[PDB]
Structures are given as structure tokens and as C-alpha cells.
Design an enzyme around this catalytic site. Sequence first.
Site, PDB file in Angstrom:
ATOM      1  N   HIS A  24       0.841  -1.197   0.000  1.00 57.16           N
ATOM      2  CA  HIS A  24       0.000   0.000   0.000  1.00 57.16           C
ATOM      3  C   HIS A  24       0.878   1.250   0.000  1.00 57.16           C
ATOM      4  CE1 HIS A  24      -2.444  -3.147   2.145  1.00 57.16           C
ATOM      5  NE2 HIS A  24      -3.277  -2.799   1.180  1.00 57.16           N
ATOM      6  N   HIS A  70       5.910   6.859   6.677  1.00 53.11           N
ATOM      7  CA  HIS A  70       5.604   6.439   5.318  1.00 53.11           C
ATOM      8  C   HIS A  70       5.022   7.637   4.583  1.00 53.11           C
ATOM      9  CE1 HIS A  70       1.978   6.020   7.770  1.00 53.11           C
ATOM     10  NE2 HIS A  70       1.351   6.440   6.687  1.00 53.11           N
ATOM     11  N   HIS A 100       2.285   9.088   1.185  1.00 54.15           N
ATOM     12  CA  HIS A 100       1.101   8.913   0.345  1.00 54.15           C
ATOM     13  C   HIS A 100       1.425   9.870  -0.800  1.00 54.15           C
ATOM     14  CE1 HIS A 100      -1.443   6.853   3.311  1.00 54.15           C
ATOM     15  NE2 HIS A 100      -0.765   7.576   4.185  1.00 54.15           N
ATOM     16  N   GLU A 122      -3.242  13.525   1.549  1.00 48.99           N
ATOM     17  CA  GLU A 122      -4.501  13.057   2.091  1.00 48.99           C
ATOM     18  C   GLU A 122      -5.234  14.250   2.664  1.00 48.99           C
ATOM     19  OE1 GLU A 122      -3.386   9.461   4.524  1.00 48.99           O
ATOM     20  OE2 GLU A 122      -4.379   8.571   2.770  1.00 48.99           O
ATOM     21  N   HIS A 163       3.908  10.882   6.711  1.00 52.17           N
ATOM     22  CA  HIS A 163       3.304  10.597   8.000  1.00 52.17           C
ATOM     23  C   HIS A 163       4.304   9.936   8.937  1.00 52.17           C
ATOM     24  CE1 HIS A 163      -1.064  10.498   6.228  1.00 52.17           C
ATOM     25  NE2 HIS A 163      -0.614  11.726   6.415  1.00 52.17           N
ATOM     26  N   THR A 221      -5.695   6.635   8.285  1.00 59.23           N
ATOM     27  CA  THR A 221      -6.285   6.895   6.977  1.00 59.23           C
ATOM     28  C   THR A 221      -6.404   5.649   6.105  1.00 59.23           C
ATOM     29  OG1 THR A 221      -4.148   7.511   6.031  1.00 59.23           O
ATOM     30  CG2 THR A 221      -5.522   9.297   6.955  1.00 59.23           C
ATOM     31  N   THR A 222      -6.066   4.494   6.672  1.00 58.29           N
ATOM     32  CA  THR A 222      -6.172   3.226   5.957  1.00 58.29           C
ATOM     33  C   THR A 222      -6.817   2.197   6.880  1.00 58.29           C
ATOM     34  OG1 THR A 222      -3.983   2.457   6.712  1.00 58.29           O
ATOM     35  CG2 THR A 222      -4.071   3.613   4.595  1.00 58.29           C
TER      36      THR A 222
HETATM   37 ZN   LIG Z   1      -0.367   7.616   6.252  1.00 53.60          ZN
END
Ligand SMILES: [Zn+2]
Length: 257
Positions: free
Chosen positions: A61, A91, A93, A103, A116, A195-196
Site C-alpha cells: 500500500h 511512510h 502517500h 490526504e 506521515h 487513513t487506511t
Molecule cells: Zn499515512
Amino acid sequence: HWGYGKHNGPEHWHKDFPIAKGERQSPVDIDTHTAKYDPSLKPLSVSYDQATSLRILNNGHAFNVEFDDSQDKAVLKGGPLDGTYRLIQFHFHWGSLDGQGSEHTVDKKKYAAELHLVHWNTKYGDFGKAVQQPDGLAVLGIFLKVGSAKPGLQKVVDVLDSIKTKGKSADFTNFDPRGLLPESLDYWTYPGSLTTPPLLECVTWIVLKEPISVSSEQVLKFRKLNFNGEGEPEELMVDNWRPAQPLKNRQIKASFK
Ligand SMILES: [Zn+2]
């Protein structure tokens, strides 16, 4: 399982994870003119002096740079936080184009990517217990815009070739997260969630106002990663971001005017 595609993306998550339509979901759009300056907030304290990075991994992901969190070696404190929060991993996004990828959004503006830095409240003993609490995690969000290269990010960019596919991991010792921070620590903060999936509502979000700059070449290498595992049809890892969710009954506080 879950993903970011047409048939397993964010629009579908609520089916296996109903909390997706919950009371405090993230990310959200930061309406800069609605956030309230809070002079009761204390200075944000980022102590990454003894941070010990261990490994980098492509989990299908995104990719995580994990840290040794067996002791208070890299912690986040102050601001809206009570107590000490240990860094466990960070990590990103990102998007398929420079005009999307983050995000959280600022006045509806989408950034090229979002970093993040995940921390957990040490009062709960371990990460697994922390995600079950309303104040279990503190995630520091940093926006990335495309411009000049970020020196401190290059070490990460150069190792991405070794973890191209899902499941791959490489040693990543001696990495200094302090090299990814912008000059200013001004921020916005609100109570939210991961957020996941499992989208647990255990996060105090701390989003920095000042973005960092990364080069076109650097983000291009992020987009070369794969969602798929080795020996499978290629699916470029791009647009692994969840869109903004309803703010609902929450208020965003600002550390600055
Ligand atoms: Zn994140």
C-alpha cells in the site's frame, strides 16, 4: 482485500470497516479560515536525537521505514499532546501527478505527497494497545510540494529499487528522520483516525503548515514502486491516498495566527 483501485478503493472500505463512516475519520480538509488559534497550546517538541531506524518495507500500500521503539529514543511531545509518544514508523502517500497525492488538503489544495511520522502513547505499553485508545497515537503530517530536491530524503529514494514489490524489505539503519522536517513547526491539530483500514479512531493529528520541497526526479522514483508482488502483472504504486472526509462535530486548532 482493500486497496486504492476502482473496485477495492476508499469508496468500498466501509463495507468491511464500517467505522469508515464514523465520528472522527481522517483525512479532512483544513479550512485555514475556520481553524481557531489556540494560545493554550505549548511548543511542539520533536526529539529525534537518538532515533534508530531498522528497516524499510513495501507492504503493498506504501512503504514503511520502521524504528526501534523499545525505549524512548525518538519521541514527540508538547503541542496538544499529553505525555510521551514514541516514533514507530513513517511512510508517504503520493499521486500519479504533481497536483494530487496528499490526504489532508489545505483550503481544498492538494499537495504532491504527504509524509506521515507515526508515534504511539507510551502510557499504553505497546502500539497494539495504543490503537485501541482515543489518544493512543500522534501522527505528524508533512506536505510535499515539487521543486528543489530534499537532501535528507535521497537516502530513502536510492533504496526504493531494492523494495520495488509487495513484501520486499531492506536494511535501513542509521537514517535520520530530522532531515525530513521543514524549518517551521507551526501546525494545525484535530482528533482523527488512521487513513487506511482498519481506520481506527485513535489519532491526534498534527499537520505542519510549512511543506517541504522534493524534486521531480525524487517523486518520480516513488511512482516506480509496485502495488503488486514479484512475478505479478505490474501495477504502479500511485495515488495511494484517501480523499478528505467530513469534519462533522470536530474543531481544528491552529498553533499560529
Ligand atoms: Zn499515512
